[PDB]
Symmetry: C4
Subunit: 232 residues, 4 copies
C-alpha cells in the first residue's frame, strides 16, 4: 500500500505479460509440427494476467495495462492522480521484458525480429489475415470495452470475493482467441509498445493506433458499467 511498491507490482505484471504472451508467440507458436498456434499464444497471454493478478493484484489491483488503468478511472474506480505513474511503470516493465525476449530470440540461427513482426500489432498488410483498418478499429473498441465491462463487474462490491483474477485473465485469453488473425491483438497499449520498438519498421508507424483505440475502447467500457450497471 506504498506507491513505490505498487509501481513495482505493475512494472512486474506488465513485464510478465509481455515476456509471457510475446515470448510464446515468438518462441513457440510457429515451431514446426509441435508448435502451440494462436490458441497457445492466447492461453499464455491470459495466464500472465491471472497468475500476476493473484500474485500482485492485492498490492496494486493488477492493471498491467494503460487501457485498463485509464478505464478504471473512467468507471470511477481509480483516481486521476495515480494514472500516469501506473501507465509509465507498465510501459517501462514491458520494455525490459521485450528486450530480454529479443536477446533470447536471437540465440537462434535465422531470427529476423524485423521480417517476422516480432509479434507486433498492425493493420492492413501488417495484419496477419490482412483485415482493413475498419476491421482493426471495431474489434479493439468492442474488445477493450468488453474487457473493462469484465474488470468492473468481476471486482464489483457484490461480486463474490477472490475470483476476479480468474474472470479477468480468462477474458484476456478469450480476447486473443477472437482478434489475433486481425491485428495480433493489442487491447494493451503497453504490450504493443514493447515489441514495436524491436520490429523497428512498420510497427512503430502504426503504434499510435494501438494507443488511441484500446484506451478509447476501455474508457467506454468503464463509462458503460459506471452509468448503466453498477447502481443499485
Amino acid at each position: 500500500s506504498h506507491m513505490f511498491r505498487k509501481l513495482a507490482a505493475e512494472s512486474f505484471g506488465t513485464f510478465w505479460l509481455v515476456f509471457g504472451g510475446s515470448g510464446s508467440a515468438v518462441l513457440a507458436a510457429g515451431f514446426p509440427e509441435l508448435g502451440i498456434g494462436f490458441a497457445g499464444v492466447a492461453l499464455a497471454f491470459g495466464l500472465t494476467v491471472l497468475t500476476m493478478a493473484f500474485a500482485v493484484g492485492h498490492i496494486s489491483g493488477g492493471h498491467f495495462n494503460p487501457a485498463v488503468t485509464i478505464g478504471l478511472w473512467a468507471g470511477g474506480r481509480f483516481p486521476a492522480k495515480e494514472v500516469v505513474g501506473y501507465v509509465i511503470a507498465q510501459v517501462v516493465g514491458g520494455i525490459v521484458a521485450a528486450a530480454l525476449l529479443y536477446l533470447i530470440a536471437s540465440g537462434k540461427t535465422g531470427f529476423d525480429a524485423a521480417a517476422s513482426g516480432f509479434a507486433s500489432n498492425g493493420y492492413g498488410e501488417h495484419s496477419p489475415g490482412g483485415y482493413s483498418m475498419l476491421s482493426a478499429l471495431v474489434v479493439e473498441l468492442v474488445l477493450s470495452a468488453g474487457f473493462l465491462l469484465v474488470i468492473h463487474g468481476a471486482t464489483d462490491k457484490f461480486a463474490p470475493a477472490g475470483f476476479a483474477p480468474i474472470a479477468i485473465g480468462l477474458a484476456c485469453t478469450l480476447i486473443h482467441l477472437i482478434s489475433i488473425p486481425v491485428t495480433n491483438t493489442s487491447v494493451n497499449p503497453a504490450r504493443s509498445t514493447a515489441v514495436a520498438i524491436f520490429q523497428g519498421g512498420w510497427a512503430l508507424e502504426q503504434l499510435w493506433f494501438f494507443w488511441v483505440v484500446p484506451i478509447v475502447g476501455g474508457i467506454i467500457g468503464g463509462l458503460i458499467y459506471r452509468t448503466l450497471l453498477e447502481k443499485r
Copy 2:
C-alpha cells in the same frame, strides 16, 4: 436489481457470447497452419459465459440464453413474468454483435458470409460432418438438459458460493467440444439467430429447429433437477 439494468446485463452477456464464440469461429478457427480449430472455438465460447457470469451474473443471474432462462423457469428458479424480456434482451444483444462481427469479417478479401456458413447452426448438408436430423435432435436435447442440470446444481443453496460461473462456463466449452462437428453447436437459440440472419440462406430455414430443440431440452433439465435432485 432494477430491471432496466438487468436487461442491459443480459443484452451485453449474450452480445459477448455471440461476438466471442462466433468471432473465434469466423476469424480464427480455419486460419491456415496456426488456427485454433474446433477446440479453440469451444474454449472461446465457454469463456464468454464464465467472464460475463462473473461480471454480470450477480446483477442478472447471467443467463445469456433463451434456453437457460426458459429452463430456469421450468426448474422453479425464474418467475414466468420476467422470461420474455430476458429472451428479447438476449436476442437483441446477439443481433448487434453478429452485425459488428460481419463488418469485421468483410474487412478481408474473399469473405463469403453465405458460402462459409458464418458459423451458423444446421443439420444434414448444413451439418459440418453431415449428421442426419435425428443426430442433431438427440445431441441438442441431451446437451441442453445436461447444461441446465449443471446450472441448477451449481447455483443450488448447498452448492458452495462463488464457483457457479466456472461450472457453468466450462460446461459450455464441454458442450462445444462434443457437438460442433454435428450441428456447429447451438444449445442457445439466441446464438443461432444472430448469425443465421447473416448467412441469409440455408441457416434461416433450419433456424426454427434450434429454437424448438434447445428449449425443450432445457425445460427437461430444469424438470429433472426440480423433481429428482433438489429435495432435501
Copy 3:
C-alpha cells in the same frame, strides 16, 4: 441426502462423463483439419467431472466412477454398504449415454462402431500406440492411485472448502493427456463398460482388465492417503 436421489446424481454424472468424454472422441477428435485431437478429448473428459461435481457433488460426493467409490471406501471415506448401489448407478448411467451416443454417431455415412474402436480401452493391438500389457498395467495402477490421492487430499478437512471439483476434474484431464496413446485411458471401469458394449468385439474381451486394474489402483491410492498423509 436421500439415497434414491443420490443414485440419480451418480447415474447422471457418469452419464455426462461417458456422453462427453466419449462423444468428443468419436465425434470431434479426428474431424479432418479442425479436429480437437487427444488434447481436446482429455479436456472434455475432465470437464465432465468438474461441471458435474460442482452440480451434484454436494448431493452425492460426485464419484461417477466405480474405481473412485471403491477407493473412497479403502481410504475410510465411504461406507462399505453404499458401495454396490453407486457402482451400479454409475454403470447404468454410462450404458444409456453410450447408446445415445451410438445413435448419434450412426447419423453419419461410414460410421463403423467396430472398426474404429468407438473410443474403447484396450492393450496390445488394441492399444492406439501399440503398448504391451505391462505398459497398460503400470500406467493405470499409477494413474488410479494418484487420482485417488488427489480426491482424498482435495476433499480433506483441512483442504479449503469449495475447490475439490476443480482439483478432481483437472486431474481427470491430466490423466488423459498422459495415457491416451497407451490404452485410450480408463481409470474408470464404468467408462470402459459403456463403449465396450458397442465395439462388440475386441473391447469386451479386454474389458475385465479395466475393471481389475483401475480398482486395485484406486484402493492403493486410498490406502496411501489413509495411512500415510491424513494424520494429524
Copy 4:
C-alpha cells in the same frame, strides 16, 4: 504436520509432476496426427502442480521443486533447516516416476530413450529449437524469478485464501508455453534430474546447468518479493 508425512507429500507431488509432465511429452506430444504438441505438455505439467497443491499443499505447502523450496527460504517463508529433506524427497520421488515412465515407454516397438531425449532439458544442439547457452540462461533465470514472484504473492497473507494452487499451477503451464522450444523447460532441478538419468548421454553432462540456473533464478524471485513488495 509431522515431517515424515510432509516428506511423503513432497515425494508424491514431485512424483506426479515428473510422471505427468514427462509422461505427456514422451507418450503423447508427438503421436502422429492427433498428438497434443507443446501446448498439451505445458498443460499436463501445470496440472501436476495444481491437483497436487490442492491435494497435499495443505500438508507440506506443495513445493515439488528444489528451486521453489530454496526460493521460499530466500523470501523468508521456509526455514533453512527443512530445506535439504524436501529437496531430497522431491529428487527421490522424481526418480521413481521417471523409472516407471521408462518401463511404460519401452512397452512400444522403437522406443529409444537416448535418441529422443526422453524429454530431457538441454541447451545448444540439445535445445529442441537450437538456442545458444545465453538463451537458455536468461529464460530460466527470468522464468524462475517470476515463478517465485507468483508463489510469494499468491500465498501472501493478504492474498484471499484458497486460490494459490490455481495461481501457482497455471504459472507452471505458462512457463512451459514460453520456454519449451528453448530448453524443453526445467525451472525444476528435480524434473531435469529424473529424465536425465534415463537419457544417459548428453542430458547428464548439461544437468548441472539446470541445478544452478533455476535455483539462482528462484532465490532472486524470493529476494524481490521479500524486500520490494511484501511490506506493508
